[PDB]
Specification:
part of a larger assembly; 9 chains; A mainly alpha (83); B mainly alpha (52); F alpha+beta (1111); G mainly alpha (14); H mainly alpha (94); B: 1 helix; elongated; F: alpha+beta; Dna-directed Rna Polymerase Ii 140kd Polypeptide, Chain: B, domain 3; OB fold (Dihydrolipoamide Acetyltransferase, E2P); 29 helices; binds magnesium ion; binds zinc ion; DNA-binding; transferase (chain F); DNA-dir_RNA_pol_bsu_ext_1_sf (chain F); DNA-directed RNA polymerase subunit beta (chain F); DNA-dir_RNA_pol_bsu_external_1 (chain F); ribonucleoside binding (chain F)
Chain lengths: 83, 52, 263, 104, 39, 1111, 14, 94, 221
DNA sequence: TATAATGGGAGCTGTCACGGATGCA
DNA sequence: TGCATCCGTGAGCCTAG
């Protein structure tokens, strides 16, 4: 099934995205009837919510990377080797 | 560098009996060529009084 | 229901809509208690339904509820939510922000690609809390409060505060943006160079990606605050780091009219 | 706990009443002489919250020592005035009325 | 923009939309932007 | 200096009074000069005669009268009053039963008066009523878009004066009349009009296939009363079909001259189109009890004949300027006056039932508040009532001469397609095809042509000279577009000897179509090329060499010129710059011949022939709507003899009576180290040195002190916790003294407001105890100077309550206005522009010793980039530069007419006369050719610009005739490797200045509901990081920067407080939190009965309100 | 469709 | 252009990972007052005020330079969070 | 119509008046019903208008006074050819009315304005969006208050534990309440005079530290 | 608190294109 | 099942105002 960009954007899973795009009342009525849950998968969702978007420095792929200097590195190494 | 006119409060003024505004009077005072003969001298205050 | 400078009151249309609803509902309750006939009770019930409709989505059904002596439809909750002026598009997908400025831009050909010219007085406000902290570090003020009261007046500003602002903005970058922002290159990060005057100095090579020229354009400035935001702006958004267009891969930071002409 | 999802659903009358801190019975807004909110109106402090932080309407309780107390003379809880941005009211319709979204 | 493999986490959708939209104001014996929208 | 003027064309007539479109309009509308009995049924008189008499008791209208203004124009502008005249109306109340008559003159409030220049003073602010173009009322025929061989006939009255009526021939064959969004068979209405089948068949049977569909046997069977009742049932279902009700409704729909009104234009157009005569401005009449048709049968006959194909019936071009008319100030004000009068009449009729019917007077019967408010509404909040654009005098002139397609009764922006915005052929000589805004308003806002004038029916007429035989008469005929479509009209430049056409073939127009035609076919001829363009466009010399897109930019930007303290008329004028000043009333002129008695900086006294001694005061340093100093200077001397129409005082932006919008600067066209890159402009510091492009501006600050529920706001010098350093320049009463310099943060007016009731925090209790000082009752609320503003205090107006002649709005004790002036010099970021569309920002101000300079030491003033020229196609500025070089050396100015200006041969001749002065002075002073000049000549003859082998002087002359000269780089002394165009160009400093634009904020005011920063420099607001900005940040992947914009910068209250605290303490900014606007969204959705719940990954609720909204 | 018209019709039946 | 930005991008599988590393290290430096730096005194970034060459206050500049030196180890799941924080505050107290 | 209440609202209130009239009507008087009906219907309509037509509701007698003021001003303007002053309006109102009273009555009669009033002829800007929020503290204000708390605690550390506690209790830094000297004496087991004395000496040491360090003066605004 | 009084009134005007529901042959 | 026809909804960004 092929739809245009407008209908495809309106038909997405995120009711926040759809209702902030267009046909706000239609989207909100159908979503509230269905009891829809927005999982906050896309950008517009987390932008509305003020959350850190899931791209770039917000991508889970790079989010949790740590930095540590070799001094503290060896220190904690011997520390966790002392038990 | 500086001009005081009696009974004139600011540059955007106008003296009665004078055709010029203070802006134009100052623009004319910008052309005054004042030669100091004494090289040690560094500030003069010319005084002008006129009527009629 | 707020008082304004002149002691006058401004109120939302939702209050008048709610008042319509309260009045019609109380009159319906009293009409029912007094055993009013069915024609009257029916009229009151249909008016109550219309009042609820006007509160929730005014203009949806029937004529829009207006204010007395006005053609302006009252702003209902549906109107508040939806539209280009609606809640989502106007205040959730985009906001007015602190630590931002706006000024007329100027050609500034002496800058290196990673630089821009930020006027002193703009940076004074754009970095005001950093400058307060640095004026406390250096001896220029006993505390933040005294430093701020010292900056408040424009004749109380001495040269040490300018050198302190220089120490403050060292290495930091600011975001320049020119509307309309048509692609990600409509915002770029530059190391600012404090200059006298009141004009922003753009670099020549970025004018093309900005669609900027110098017939009266203006650009907005934003100060990334956190170390994380500064890292983002310097690594990912620095002008000299975006030379090829993401749309075609070809360089879009390339020589322009005067440069091409001389060469 | 951190937010992960956002659910939107229809509201029961019981849930609408559970949101509400009081019924707006009068259509008045504020008094024409005192400029204070009119009781049981659209800006009632007893319903929606104190206009000023930790200060009930009449002024018997005016500090943080009483947070949660509901003044016996005026009926206003002494908490942060920010709650007047948050606390819902309600109106009890005599005849039920259709939500025009689900109609039109 | 870098002539190298794209880094994981790039907002590729937004980049695509902006890349397609930016020259729209330039689209003119030609069907042009109405054709682009019809597609 | 000498003023050489080119141009063979001699104009048989001068330009009409340029503001007459406003002046005559309002004068005819008011009829204040006509004695009442001799007034005509127009304007206010027509409105009164339309509203009266008022029946059921009878109240009739005798006459009206206007009084004298209670306060003159200057006092109105001073005290924020409306310049207006008192309106009285003599009304006699009659009892049709008794015969009693009680006649009284009731006072219906005030009506705003138009000033001398065609503007208005509404609440002290100058405003202009912009003319409105719209489709003329009448009867039109336009093709049905569905069926090609069918046509819709439209009947269109004045706006708000009746419904449109559409006649269509349906596919089923019957003719349908469509009114008020409802269709029915026209046959029923014809039967109501008294038409019978015999007359209809004998009147329309010539068209075979249509009268059959017209025939309806049942409708012909039923009587006129039955058909009227049936039509009422068809038009208003549910309403009981009472016979008197149906009579009233159909009458007020089709025949009531009070409820249905064609224009006078509409009546004439219907007559001219259908070959009929109208009794009045209605479609039918009510005579002797029955309806008598006047419009419907003619329109139906025309529609049938058009559908058939009968010769003599055409479709109508609805964008023809004979079908689009101009509603001027008089007509718009009259419409609003009629509506206010109708509301007053409703009140009168309602009171003619209440009260005691035995004892009543017109003074008791009339309440004027409807009319008062309906006039105030128009003048104060109409879209066509605009804040007057009085930057310079040409701004006001052009503003008054503008035509809007927008506004009440017209198109909204979405309803504008291409047909309206298009330049129609009939715009020739009526609407300027150049002067129009860029952007969404293009083709909707336009300007009246120079020679064009609006006739009494509202159509724009343009003049033409009569041509009989081959002789061109001096008699002019002003024609509408409709009448212009009848004649062959030759061009204005067609050659002549005396009054006779010279050429064998002339260029002419038939219905705008261009055609080469013999002198015997010439019926009329153009007056001048000027008549094709607006007043602003006619100020663009060498316009014939400028592409229209950039000519538009120059024409519009002339409006934005700032009056400079040393303004000059351009070296290359077009001829209109004197009439512009005159008709704009900038300058001051002598009434009759006489002799100057006195000359002051404030006034000029003249003794005329009549012996009477007349004194003219001079407006000195007044602030205009846009803060540009309107200021008159005296241009005569004591004892100087003057004639009628001579100049006594120059207005702002006027030099000796010539429009002086900018300055004449020496410009070199060359790149310069990238400082003119992409239209930037380089200027010499010598411009600042001699105060070129230096303008005086004034700003008005205002502060009120009113009564509170906590005590009186007091304007006072006693402000708590402030030093004498901060209070230095305040007088006894707290107001800044006249003449003191004020910087950002300085107090203009001191004010104390009473502190709001609040308990001191325990911190404040302990601090007050530590210091031993009472916390004052009042609070510093003084009016300080905004950031980036300031200057010199030149005026202070103080108004209290209780002092004579003053009454403020209720509650306000006192008002104070401070006026702060400033002498703005040119600086980087200011916008310059020439009359050809070349506009730029000052980017680099170089010291004189760096400027490209002539061999004789003369440095240029402005460096412009040739790269601005080729893609813009505005060579007129190049021609102006050449002629300016010539005139710069010859010491003379020129008047080059539009499309009849200086041509290249004559420009070369003047350039040679100038080169003689340039080079012979040197060769006589004892100097030969420079070595660098020889090198430049070498490279120039390599460029093919001079002939190899001629002398250096001859080659330099060859270059000079091309407008190019040798230029030394002041930084090296080495010459520019090529010859460069240097000359005098007229350049203006536009209104857009960096001191006005530059703004910056760190923290400031937030909005009430959204808790986001406010917007606009005026409110110290933040920049809008909108959707597309968020998109840019997303595509970059700057998640934390985006989250800062979303939370810490604007909406996170907790986070913004904590972030400011962390930055002033030296800590890293804290992790953000929930945006207050998202909380607002949640609560508004709850108000819409929608449960919105934030959830953790276990699907349990998450309270983003932290317990404050849950019991 | 029009509440005033509908109520006027309802009135016009008694 | 930031000095050695090409090598800094070569160090990582994702430029955004590079940015996160730089930002977290700058946070470390600010929180510990630079007493934890991996830069020798001759490698410290300097700025030119009227007094003289002073330590560059830009912790992000510092962190990029340290990353270039390579005495920093970066990656996911290297140490518990509280353990890292407490060991860093034990070595370099606040 | 056009008095603040809609046509249908006026119709419903008039129906209420008609119900009252049906209840109170006395056919014995031989009057047609419409007379008594009309009286009660007019009364109900006018009461409803006065009660509801204002956002800030105003008592009915005050409404009638304001409308008397309105008609007085209108008569004066129709007889003077100009709008009247407060003094002329007070004169025409007669005994007990002065210009101050006329002005205060006019001020009380001022109706509120809409926050969504359009600013500009385009549909982009509302009047409310230019109205700042004065209630919520600014970031600068909140930071100043927290800095004041921190500096006050700094200065209170320069005291002894007990003599800083006496000040914290007597000035509300603890409990939010200001304890009396007898209460602080009962808490520390000393005489009320003893607590007053150690409070005096604690404030003395604080004043000395202040005159020495000048760390709190900037907080006096 | 009483003479009788018994169904409103403004509309509004030069766009357009599409999607989806209703309405007829 | 197929069309006309009606209703509802959307129609660029920032500035100032
Ligand atoms: Mg530009
Ligand atoms: Zn209380």
């Amino acid at each position: 099934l092929l739809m245009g960009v407008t209908k495809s954007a309106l038909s997405t899973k995120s009711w926040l995205s759809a209702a902030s795009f267009q046909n706000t009342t239609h989207v909100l009525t159908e979503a509230a009837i269905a009891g829809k849950k927005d999982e906050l998968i896309g950008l517009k969702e987390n932008v509305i919510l003020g959350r850190l978007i899931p791209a770039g420095t917000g991508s889970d792929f790079v989010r949790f990377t740590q930095v540590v200097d070799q001094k503290t590195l060896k220190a904690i190494e011997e520390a966790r080797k002392e038990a | 560098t500086s001009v005081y006119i009696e009974d004139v409060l600011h540059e955007f003024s106008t003296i009665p009996g004078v055709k010029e505004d203070v802006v134009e009077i100052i623009l004319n005072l910008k052309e005054l060529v004042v030669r100091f003969l004494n090289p040690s001298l560094q500030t003069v205050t010319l005084l002008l009084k006129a009527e009629g | 229901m707020v008082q304004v400078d002149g002691g006058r009151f401004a109120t939302s249309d939702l209050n008048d809509l709610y008042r319509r609803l309260i009045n019609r509902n109380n009159r319906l309750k009293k009409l029912l208690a007094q055993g009013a006939p069915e024609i009257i009770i029916r009229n009151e019930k249909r008016m109550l339904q219309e009042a609820v409709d006007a509160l929730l989505d005014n203009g949806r059904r029937g004529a829009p509820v207006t204010n007395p002596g006005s053609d302006r439809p009252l702003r209902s909750l549906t109107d508040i939510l939806s539209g280009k002026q609606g809640r989502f598009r106007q205040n959730l997908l985009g906001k007015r922000v602190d630590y931002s400025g706006r000024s007329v831009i100027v050609v500034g050909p002496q800058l290196k690609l990673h630089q821009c010219g930020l006027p002193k007085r703009m940076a004074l406000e754009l970095f005001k809390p950093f400058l307060l902290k640095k004026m406390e570090e250096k001896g220029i003020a006993p505390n933040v409060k005294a430093a701020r009261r010292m900056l408040e007046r424009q004749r109380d500003i001495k040269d040490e505060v300018w050198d302190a602002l220089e120490e403050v903005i060292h290495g930091k970058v600011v975001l320049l943006n020119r509307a309309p922002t048509l692609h990600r290159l409509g915002i770029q990060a530059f190391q600012p160079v404090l200059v006298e005057g009141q004009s922003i100095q753009l670099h020549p090579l970025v004018c093309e990606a900005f669609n900027a020229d110098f017939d009266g354009d203006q650009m907005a400035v934003h100060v990334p605050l956190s170390s994380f935001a500064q890292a983002e702006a310097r690594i990912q958004m620095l002008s000299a780091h975006n030379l090829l267009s993401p749309a075609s891969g070809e360089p879009l930071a390339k020589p322009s009219r005067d440069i091409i002409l001389g060469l | 706990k951190e937010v992960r999802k956002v659910r939107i659903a229809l509201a029961s009358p019981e849930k609408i009443r559970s949101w509400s801190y009081g019924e707006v019975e009068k259509p008045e807004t504020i008094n024409y002489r005192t400029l204070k909110p009119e009781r049981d109106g659209l800006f009632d402090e007893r319903i929606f919250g104190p206009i000023k932080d930790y200060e009930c309407a009449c002024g018997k309780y005016k500090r943080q020592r009483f947070e949660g107390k509901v003044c016996e003379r005026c009926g206003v809880e002494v908490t942060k005035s920010i709650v007047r941005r948050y606390r819902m009211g309600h109106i009890e319709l005599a005849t039920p009325a259709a939500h025009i979204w689900f109609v039109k | 923009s870098m002539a190298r493999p794209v880094s994981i986490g790039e907002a590729v959708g937004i980049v695509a939309a902006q890349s397609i939209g930016e020259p729209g104001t330039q689209l003119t014996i030609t069907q042009g932007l109405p054709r682009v929208i019809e597609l | 200096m000498e003023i050489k003027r080119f141009g063979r064309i001699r104009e048989v007539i001068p330009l009409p009074p340029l503001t007459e479109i406003q002046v005559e309009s309002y004068r005819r509308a008011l009829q204040a000069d006509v004695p009442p009995e001799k007034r005509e049924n127009v304007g206010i008189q027509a409105a009164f005669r339309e509203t009266f008499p008022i029946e059921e008791l009878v109240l009739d209208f005798l006459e009206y009268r206007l009084g004298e203004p209670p306060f003159p124009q200057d006092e109105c502008r001073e005290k924020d009053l409306t310049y207006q005249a008192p309106l009285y109306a003599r009304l006699q109340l009659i009892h049709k039963d008794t015969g009693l008559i009680k006649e009284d003159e009731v006072f219906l409030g005030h009506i705003p008066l138009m000033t001398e220049d065609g503007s208005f003073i509404i609440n002290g602010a100058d405003r202009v009523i912009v003319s409105q173009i719209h489709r003329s009322p009448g009867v039109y025929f336009t093709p049905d878009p569905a069926r090609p061989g069918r046509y819709i006939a439209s009947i269109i009255p004045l706006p708000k004066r009746g419904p449109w009526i559409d006649l269509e021939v349906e596919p089923n064959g019957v003719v349908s009349m469509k009114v008020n969004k409802r269709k029915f068979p026209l046959v029923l209405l014809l039967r109501v009009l008294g038409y019978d089948q015999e007359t209809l068949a004998r009147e329309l049977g010539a068209y075979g296939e249509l009268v059959q569909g017209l025939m309806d046997e049942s409708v012909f069977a039923m009587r006129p009363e039955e058909a009227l009742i049936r039509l009422f049932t068809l038009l208003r279902p549910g309403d009981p079909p009472k016979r008197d009700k149906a009579v009233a409704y159909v009458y007020g729909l089709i025949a009531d001259p009070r409820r249905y009104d064609l224009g006078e234009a509409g009546r004439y157009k219907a007559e001219e189109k259908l070959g009929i005569r109208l009794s009045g401005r209605t479609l039918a009449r009510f005579e002797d009890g029955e309806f008598k048709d006047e419009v419907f049968l003619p329109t139906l006959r025309y529609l049938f004949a058009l559908t058939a194909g009968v010769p003599g019936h055409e479709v109508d071009d609805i964008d023809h300027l004979g079908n689009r008319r101009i509603r001027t100030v008089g007509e718009l004000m009259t419409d609003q006056f009629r509506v206010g009068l109708a509301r007053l009449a409703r009140g009168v009729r309602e009171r003619m039932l209440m009260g005691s019917e035995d004892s009543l007077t017109p003074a008791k019967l009339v309440n004027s508040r409807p009319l008062e408010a309906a006039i105030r509404e128009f003048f104060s909040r109409s879209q066509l009532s605009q804040f007057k654009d009085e930057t310079n005098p040409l701004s006001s002139l052009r503003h008054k001469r503008r035509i809007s397609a927008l506004g009440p009764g017209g198109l909204t922006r979405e309803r504008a397609g291409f047909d309206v915005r298009d330049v129609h052929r009939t715009h020739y000589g009526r609407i300027c095809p150049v002067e129009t805004p860029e952007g969404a308003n293009i083709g909707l806002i336009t300007s009246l042509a120079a020679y064009a004038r609006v006739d009494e029916l509202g159509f724009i007429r343009t003049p033409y000279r009569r041509v009989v035989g081959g002789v061109v008469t001096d008699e002019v005929v002003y024609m509408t577009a409709t009448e212009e479509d009848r004649y062959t009209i030759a061009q204005a430049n067609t050659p002549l000897e005396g009054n006779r056409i010279a050429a064998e073939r002339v260029v002419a127009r038939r219905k705008g179509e261009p055609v080469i035609v013999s002198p015997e076919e010439v019926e009329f001829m153009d007056v001048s090329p000027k008549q094709v363009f607006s007043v602003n466009t006619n100020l663009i010399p060498f316009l014939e060499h400028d592409d229209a897109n950039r000519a538009l930019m120059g024409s519009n930007m002339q409006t934005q010129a700032v009056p400079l303290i040393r303004a000059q008329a351009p070296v290359v004028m077009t001829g209109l710059e004197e009439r512009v000043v005159r008709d704009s009333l900038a300058a001051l002129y002598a009434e009759e011949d006489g002799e100057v008695a006195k000359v002051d900086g404030n006034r000029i006294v003249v003794r005329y022939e009549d012996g009477r001694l007349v004194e003219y005061p001079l407006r000195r340093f007044y602030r205009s709507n846009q803060g540009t100093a309107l200021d008159q200077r005296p241009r005569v001397v004591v004892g100087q003899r003057v004639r009628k129409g001579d100049l006594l005082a120059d207005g702002p932006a006027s030099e000796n009576g010539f429009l002086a919008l900018g300055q004449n600067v020496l410009v070199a066209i060359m790149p310069f180290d990238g400082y003119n890159f992409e239209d930037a402009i380089v200027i010499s510091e010598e411009l600042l040195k001699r105060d070129f492009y230096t303008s005086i501006h004034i700003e008005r600050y205002e502060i009120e002190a009113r009564d509170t529920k906590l005590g009186p706001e007091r304007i006072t010098r006693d402000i708590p916790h402030l030093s004498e350093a901060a209070l230095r320049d305040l007088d006894e009463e707290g107001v800044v003294r006249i003449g003191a310099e004020v910087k950002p943060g300085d107090i203009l007016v001191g004010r104390t407001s009473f502190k709001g009731e609040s308990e001191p925090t325990p911190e404040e209790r302990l601090l007050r105890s530590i210091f031993g000082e009472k916390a004052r009752d009042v609070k510093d609320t003084s009016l300080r100077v905004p950031p980036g503003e300031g200057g010199i205090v030149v005026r202070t107006v103080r108004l209290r309550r209780g002092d004579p002649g003053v009454e403020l709005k209720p509650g306000v004790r006192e008002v104070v206005r401070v006026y702060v002036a400033q002498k703005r010099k040119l600086q980087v970021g200011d916008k310059l522009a020439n009359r050809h569309g070349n506009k730029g920002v000052v980017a680099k101000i170089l010291p004189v010793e760096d400027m490209p300079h002539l061999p004789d030491g003369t440095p240029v003033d402005v460096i412009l980039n040739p790269l601005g020229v080729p893609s813009r196609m505005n060579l007129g500025q190049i021609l102006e530069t050449h002629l300016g070089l010539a005139g710069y050396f010859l010491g003379q100015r020129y008047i080059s007419p539009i499309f009849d200006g200086a041509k290249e041969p004559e420009i070369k001749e003047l350039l040679a006369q100038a080169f003689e002065v340039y080079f012979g002075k040197r060769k006589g002073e004892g100097f030969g050719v420079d070595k660098r000049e020889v090198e430049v000549l070498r490279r120039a003859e390599k460029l093919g610009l001079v002939t190899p082998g001629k002398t250096p002087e001859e080659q330099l002359k060859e270059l000079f005739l091309q407008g190019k000269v040798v230029l030394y780089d002041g930084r090296t002394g080495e010459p520019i490797e090529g010859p460069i165009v240097v000359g005098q160009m007229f350049i203006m400093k536009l209104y857009h200045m960096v001191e006005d634009k530059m703004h910056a904020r760190s923290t400031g005011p937030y909005s009430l509901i959204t808790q986001q920063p406010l917007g606009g420099k005026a409110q110290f607001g933040g920049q809008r990081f909108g959707e597309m900005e968020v998109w840019a940040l997303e595509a970059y992947g700057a998640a934390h920067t985006l989250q800062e914009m979303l939370t810490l910068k604007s909406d996170d209250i907790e986070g913004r407080n904590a972030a400011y605290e962390a930055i002033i303490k030296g800590e890293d900014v804290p992790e953000p939190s929930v945006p207050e606007s998202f909380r607002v969204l949640v609560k508004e959705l709850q108000a819409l009965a929608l449960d919105v719940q934030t959830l953790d990954e276990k699907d349990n609720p998450v309270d983003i309100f932290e317990g404050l909204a849950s019991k | 469709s029009d509440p005033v018209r509908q109520y006027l019709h309802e009135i016009g039946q008694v | 252009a930031e000095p050695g930005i090409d090598k800094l991008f070569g160090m990582v599988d994702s430029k955004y990972r590079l940015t996160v590393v730089v930002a977290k290290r700058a946070q470390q430096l600010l929180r510990h007052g630079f007493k934890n730096t991996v830069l020798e005194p001759e490698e410290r970034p300097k700025m030119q005020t009227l007094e003289g060459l002073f330590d560059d206050p830009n912790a992000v500049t510092w962190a990029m330079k340290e990353l270039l030196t390579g005495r920093l180890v970066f990656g996911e799941n290297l140490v518990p969070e509280d353990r890292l924080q407490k060991e860093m505050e034990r070595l370099y107290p606040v | 119509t056009g008095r603040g209440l809609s046509f249908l609202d006026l119709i419903q209130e008039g129906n209420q008046g008609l119900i009252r009239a049906v209840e109170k009507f006395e056919y014995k008087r031989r009057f047609k019903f419409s007379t008594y009906a009309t009286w009660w219907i007019r009364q109900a309509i006018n009461r409803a208008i006065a009660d509801q037509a204002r956002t800030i509701r105003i008592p009915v007698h005050m409404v009638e006074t304001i409308n008397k003021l309105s008609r007085t001003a209108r008569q004066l303007q129709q007889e003077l050819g100009r709008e009247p002053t407060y003094e002329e309006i007070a004169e025409a109102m007669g005994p007990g009315w002065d210009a101050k009273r006329v002005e205060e009555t006019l001020k009380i009669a001022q109706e509120p304005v809409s926050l969504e009033t359009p600013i500009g002829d385009e549909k982009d800007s509302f009047y409310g969006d230019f109205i700042p929020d004065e209630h919520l503290p600014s970031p600068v204000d909140a930071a100043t208050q927290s800095l004041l708390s921190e500096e006050l605690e700094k200065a209170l550390s320069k005291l002894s534990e007990r003599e800083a506690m006496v000040l914290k209790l007597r000035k509300g830094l603890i409990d939010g309440r200001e304890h009396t000297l007898e209460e602080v004496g009962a808490f520390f087991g000393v005489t009320r005079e003893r607590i007053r004395q150690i409070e005096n000496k604690a404030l003395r040491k604080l004043k000395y530290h202040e005159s020495r360090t000048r760390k709190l003066r900037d907080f006096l605004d």
